[PDB]
Design a protein around this ligand. Structure first.
Ligand code: CLA
Ligand code: CLA
Ligand code: CLA
Ligand code: CLA
Ligand code: CLA
Ligand code: CLA
Ligand code: CLA
Ligand code: CLA
Ligand code: XAT
Ligand code: XAT
Lengths: 41, 210, 215, 164, 194
């Protein structure tokens, strides 16, 4: 599956994994920390 | 790494404790003295902590021995951990300052012979008195040996000094840990362990204190 | 070479002879911050001074802290010694910080110029005869001269011992100050008070009994 | 009150707008059974709403005549009056991540230029090289100023022009 | 040479043996370069001169009974009427401040940047002692010794007044009165705990 891992390392597959990662990071943040308009403490 | 006496007879010894240092048995399981420039400092430190601990045990037991026998001292029966509160002809600050000036003389005189041996054996003000040349650091001799010892069988005497000194360092650590738990005189701990030796071990005092 | 992880490939710029002969090199740079050799030369200075100021600060926290909890001092908490000692003070804090930044900037800019070019402050005619003892040693970060009064540098043996003792006590004190700040934020008590609270109940009073290891 | 404004914990249009949103949620809630699944989500929306108003009034945001929080985007009016978390703290919390990505992509380009053919590792990204540069790019401003002091951040007039 | 300051220790190479007041005492290598040693051999003598004059002035006020060295510049605040041998001085602060700024600079700048001399023969020896034949270095050694002791004495004056708030004689009498309760340790300053 070395060719399958080179397919997993192509541009749109990395794009759709990394954008789901950076989407579902910010989404879990806005679940556990609702409505951040201002930098609080 | 020879037929030397050993702390554990049979095991290997790391080899740098051959017998040149007085009263060695190869006991260094943490391997501290690998660099010999640390080992020389550790030898002088064991001599100094040992001689002050021998003076400590002789100055803790003997006042308590003559207190429990009973003389008429101004300080008699006072604890060694309570002699600081006891008042004297001067308050303790002047005592500490005189101490930290006299030992500031003596310790630097000793340290200059540590960093260059044989180079402090002449007085400042009376430049005719001297210690005899050929002494090692830790053992000055001369006026520090007024009774004519160390003129034969010096290795056995150094081994006696370091054995009594290691025993007295353990005794002073005992004085600390055995005056901090039960809070009594260290001779009145021997009195209780001779009153009933079985009904007061360290374990029963620990479990009663727990 | 006694690495921080025994099985890791040490970064190759921490295995150069310039970097292996450096104080406290345990092969620890997992984020590649010193890959340029002059970046490493700058950050070695930054580590020495972040660690010496931390050793001075952590000593000034826990030596009077342990001498407060054992009596014969009444030094307050380190997070309270700015609130107090401004009343027992000849000056307010603003003038004091201004004098502080002048007296410290005169030192720190001379150190800046010595790091950017070694032996800079030793050129004659700078001070009034004092500049001759300001070349430092052959390596930067360890000046000596007036900064070694007891004379522990005139050995050339056990010198890496003194270097590594300074670096390890300094890294431990930097972790201790990051501690002091964090164990203040977490429970609002003092550091020796937190040590007593851990030593009276270790298995229940720790950083798993507050809101900072939260699931 | 910096520029004709008012604290949101002081203004009444802010509290009136909170009561307006809670009134809409309440008249929306009045249709359902009290323990059903829509009513739980509506009360959770009310709880998030009230927590949002409490934490906007707590941080000292400035309301206007409209009753809406405002952002003072000037240091020296945010640092002096305690509004640095509005713009002045996230204007570096952004730029750390911006220069982070701009440094990671820069180093991924420069570390793939000197190969056999670079373009194949731009449509097919070398993932261990990418994750190595992702982790070790954490100190990017440090490495950026150390690269600027060389002149290895810029390139000289070896660049490609037309006809000056 | 004539002295070793810590016996057994070696003398540094950058201290000349014919130099007056030599002991080898330079643990910082602070005068290693010869230009810095030439500046410091001039400045130590002048610190010793002005400290001998300072300790003589700080002791003669109390041995003549006119307050101390500390409160002698205390008329400029809370009143006036400075004295000297009991004789009044009708001068305010700014006039004598300007006279000390001007009339001393006309001798200091005449001394300093007109060379680097520290023992000028001629008018500064009216009686005649230093003909530089045989008794030059002996008198220079006595001057250095007495001046170093005077610098130590004035730093002791400063620390003694900063710790006890008294004068030199006013606490030398207490050290002679209670020798074991009137030293540098019974105050709560110099020794922090005991
Ligand atoms: C450039 C224009 C712009 C700006 C400045 C903003 C600004 C904002 N928007 Mg907005 N928005 C915009 C355009 C913009 N938006 C557009 C175009 C839309 C339509 C798509 C929206 C739709 C929108 C919605 C629907 C919401 C916002 C929200 C917000 C707030 C952000 C709260 C948040 O998510 O915190 C994020 C805070 C962080 C600290 C994230 C940083 C990430 C981590 C913590 C740092 C990294 C840590 C670690 C190293 C990561 C691990 C790495 C991993 C590999 C292990 C903020 C006021 C939210 C809000 O509350 O409104 C006020 C909200 O609900 N916006
Ligand atoms: C306006 C008048 C005037 C002028 C032009 C000079 C000019 C000079 N004096 Mg002079 N002097 C004056 C008034 C003056 N003085 C007065 C009124 C006194 C008596 C108080 C002296 C006492 C005096 C001594 C004792 C010496 C000089 C020296 C010098 C020369 C060195 C120049 C220098 O470094 O500046 C000095 C500029 C300064 C800003 C001085 C800094 C403050 C000093 C260091 C005192 C601080 C003490 C402090 C406690 C120690 C530092 C902290 C420490 C604890 C870590 C120069 C020719 C020296 C010399 O000839 O060197 C060879 C020397 O040895 N003078
Ligand atoms: C080491 C060492 C140290 C630090 C001390 C420290 C002390 N001893 Mg001590 N002692 C020691 C060894 C030591 N001892 C030994 C080896 C013996 C035997 C004694 C026998 C002894 C007695 C019998 C008494 C003390 C007392 C004291 C306390 C006051 C000292 C005093 O009165 O000045 C001593 C002043 C001198 C001028 C003596 C120095 C000159 C000698 C004679 C040279 C030889 C002090 C805590 C006294 C105490 O605790 O009572 C409250 C006390 O009564 N010691
Ligand atoms: C070998 C060194 C040594 C040791 C182990 C001790 C140990 C002790 N001293 Mg002590 N002390 C020492 C040297 C030493 N001192 C010196 C050199 C002086 C100056 C002469 C004093 C002056 C002193 C005073 C004045 C007091 C103590 C007291 C104490 C006790 C409680 C203080 C504490 O927390 O510790 C403790 C048993 C106190 C005490 O006995 O009360 C419990 C007390 O009041 N000490
Ligand atoms: C010179 C060594 C020495 C000696 C002779 C004693 C003697 C004594 N200790 Mg003690 N102790 C010592 C060192 C010593 N201690 C040290 C170093 C510590 C610190 C950990 C303590 C801490 C301590 C506590 C906390 C208690 C005692 C108690 C006692 C007494 C009862 C014995 C007991 O319960 O076992 C205690 C034995 C030990 C703690 C182990 C000591 C280990 C030594 C160093 C090895 C043995 C030395 C040698 C081979 C044989 C010694 C005899 C010889 C010197 C003549 C007894 C008088 C108890 C007491 O006062 O009740 C009456 C008690 O509660 N001791
Ligand atoms: C470095 C450093 C650090 C980490 C702190 C940290 C702190 N300072 Mg502080 N401070 C510093 C340098 C530092 N200070 C300097 C250089 C000065 C001199 C101007 C002060 C003067 C100062 C004052 C005057 C006060 C603080 C206060 C505080 C605390 C409130 C936040 C906090 C623990 C406050 C405090 O302790 O009150 C609770 C306070 O009132 N600081
Ligand atoms: C577009 C540029 C710009 C403009 C028009 C202003 C405008 C103003 N600034 Mg300002 N400022 C700016 C950029 C700017 N700032 C930047 C980049 C900084 C540095 C981060 C500051 C730091 C600053 C401070 C520290 C102060 C001002 C103040 C002021 C006010 C006078 C005025 C509202 C002052 C103020 O509060 O008003 C009296 C004031 O004290 N500014
Ligand atoms: C500020 C006054 C001052 C100055 C400029 C000097 C200068 C000198 N001394 Mg000297 N000395 C002084 C005060 C001074 N001394 C005092 C007060 C004592 C008595 C404690 C001595 C005792 C002394 C001895 C015993 C010897 C010297 C020697 C020397 C010479 C070489 C050492 C050197 O480089 O010193 C340079 C010194 C300085 C630049 C002064 C720096 C002061 C620092 C910054 C602060 C000091 C803090 C202090 C400890 C406490 C306050 C040099 C000419 C040696 C020599 O050959 O004599 C000529 C020598 O063997 N000195
Ligand atoms: C300087 C310092 C503290 C100094 C403290 C001082 C002066 C305190 C003074 C006071 O207390 C007193 C005296 C009295 C109080 O009343 C007043 C104050 C003023 C409060 C702490 C440093 C603290 C510094 C710390 C904790 C630094 C930690 C850095 C780490 C761990 C980085 C590791 C890495 O960078 C490497 C090494 C390699 C990369 O590849 C990987 C990573 C992981 C990125
Ligand atoms: C102590 C001192 C200098 C100390 C410096 C020392 C020890 C440095 C030693 C070292 O550098 C060496 C040698 C070698 C290096 O390798 C190591 C160290 C160890 C670093 C100078 C004092 C110098 C002190 C001086 C010059 C004092 C002069 C005093 C005057 C003029 C007083 C005048 C008045 O008292 C009257 C007359 C009347 C009053 O009413 C009014 C006033 C004004 C108060």
């Amino acid at each position: 599956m070395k060719d399958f891992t080179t397919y997993l390392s192509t541009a749109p597959v990395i794009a759709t994994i990394w954008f789901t990662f950076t989407a579902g990071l910010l989404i879990e943040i806005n679940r556990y920390f609702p409505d951040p308009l201002v930098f609080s403490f | 790494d020879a037929a030397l006496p050993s702390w554990m007879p049979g095991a290997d010894l790391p080899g740098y404790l051959n017998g040149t240092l007085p009263g060695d048995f190869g006991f260094d399981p943490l391997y501290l003295g690998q660099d010999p420039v640390k080992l020389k400092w550790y030898a002088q430190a064991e001599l100094m902590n040992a001689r002050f601990a021998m003076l400590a045990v002789a100055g803790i037991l003997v006042p308590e021995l003559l207190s429990n026998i009973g003389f008429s001292w101004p300080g008699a029966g006072v604890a060694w951990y309570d002699a600081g509160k006891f008042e004297y002809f001067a308050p303790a600050s002047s005592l500490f300052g005189v101490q930290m000036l006299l030992f500031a003389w003596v310790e630097i005189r000793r340290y200059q012979d540590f960093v260059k041996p044989g180079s402090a054996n002449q007085d400042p003000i009376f430049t005719n008195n001297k210690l005899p040349d050929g002494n090692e650091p830790g053992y000055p001799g001369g006026i520090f040996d007024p009774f004519g010892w160390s003129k034969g069988d010096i290795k056995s005497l150094k081994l006696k000094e370091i054995k009594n000194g290691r025993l007295a360092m353990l005794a002073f650590a005992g004085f600390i840990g055995q005056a901090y738990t039960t809070g009594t005189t260290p001779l009145k701990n021997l009195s209780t362990h001779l009153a009933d030796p079985w009904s007061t071990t360290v374990w029963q005092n620990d479990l009663a204190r727990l | 070479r006694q690495s921080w992880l025994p099985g890791s490939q040490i970064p190759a710029h921490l295995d150069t002879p310039a970097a292996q002969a450096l104080a406290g090199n345990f092969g620890f740079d997992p984020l590649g911050l010193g890959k340029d050799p002059v970046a490493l030369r700058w950050y070695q200075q930054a580590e020495l001074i972040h660690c010496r100021t931390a050793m001075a600060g952590v000593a000034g926290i826990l030596i009077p802290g342990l001498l407060t909890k054992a009596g014969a001092l009444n030094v307050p908490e380190w997070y309270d010694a700015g609130k107090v000692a401004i009343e027992n003070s000849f000056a307010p804090w603003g003038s004091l910080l201004a004098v502080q930044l002048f007296l410290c900037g005169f030192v720190e800019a001379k150190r800046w110029q010595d790091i950017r070019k070694p032996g800079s402050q030793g050129e004659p005619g700078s001070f009034l005869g004092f500049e001759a003892s300001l070349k430092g040693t052959s390596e930067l970060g360890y000046p000596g001269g007036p900064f070694d009064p007891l004379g522990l540098s005139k050995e050339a043996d056990k010198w890496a011992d003194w270097k590594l003792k300074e670096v390890k006590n300094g890294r431990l004190a930097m972790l201790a100050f990051l501690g002091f700040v964090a164990q203040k934020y977490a429970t609002g008590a003092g550091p020796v008070d937190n040590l007593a609270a851990h030593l009276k109940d270790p298995w229940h009073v720790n950083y798993a009994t507050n809101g900072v290891s939260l699931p | 009150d910096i520029a004709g404004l008012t604290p949101c914990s002081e203004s009444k249009a802010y509290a009136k707008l909170e009561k307006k949103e809670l009134k809409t949620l309440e008249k929306r809630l009045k249709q359902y059974e009290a323990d059903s699944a829509p009513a739980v989500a509506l009360k959770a929306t009310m709880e998030r709403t009230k927590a949002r108003f409490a934490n906007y009034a707590k941080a000292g945001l400035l309301c206007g005549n409209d009753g809406l929080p405002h952002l003072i985007a000037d240091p020296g009016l945010a640092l002096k009056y305690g509004h640095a978390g509005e713009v002045f703290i996230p204007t570096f919390g952004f730029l750390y991540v911006a220069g982070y990505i701009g440094y990671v992509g820069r180093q991924y380009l420069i570390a793939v230029k000197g190969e056999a053919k670079p373009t194949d590792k731009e449509i097919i990204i070398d993932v261990p090289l990418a994750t190595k540069l992702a982790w070790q790019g954490a100190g990017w401003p440090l490495a950026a100023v150390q690269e600027l002091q060389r002149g290895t951040l810029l390139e000289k007039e070896e660049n490609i022009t037309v006809s000056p | 040479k004539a002295g070793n300051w810590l016996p057994g220790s070696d003398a540094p190479a950058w201290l000349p043996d014919d130099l007056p007041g030599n002991y080898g005492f330079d643990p910082l290598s602070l005068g290693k370069e010869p230009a810095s040693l030439k500046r410091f051999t001039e400045s130590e003598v002048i610190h010793g001169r002005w400290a001998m004059l300072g300790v003589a002035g700080s002791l003669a006020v109390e041995l003549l009974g006119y307050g101390n060295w500390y409160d002698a510049p205390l008329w400029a605040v809370n009143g006036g009427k400075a004295t000297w041998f009991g004789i009044e001085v009708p001068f305010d602060l700014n006039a004598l401040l300007a006279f000390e700024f001007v009339a001393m600079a006309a001798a200091e700048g005449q001394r300093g940047d007109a060379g680097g001399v520290v023992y000028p023969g001629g008018a500064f020896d009216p009686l005649g002692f230093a003909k530089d034949s045989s008794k030059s270095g002996e008198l220079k050694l006595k001057e250095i010794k007495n001046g170093r002791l005077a610098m130590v004495a004035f730093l002791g004056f400063v620390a003694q007044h900063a710790a006890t708030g008294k004068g030199p004689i006013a606490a030398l009498g207490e050290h002679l009165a209670n020798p074991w309760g009137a030293n540098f340790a019974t105050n709560g300053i110099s020794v922090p705990f005991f």
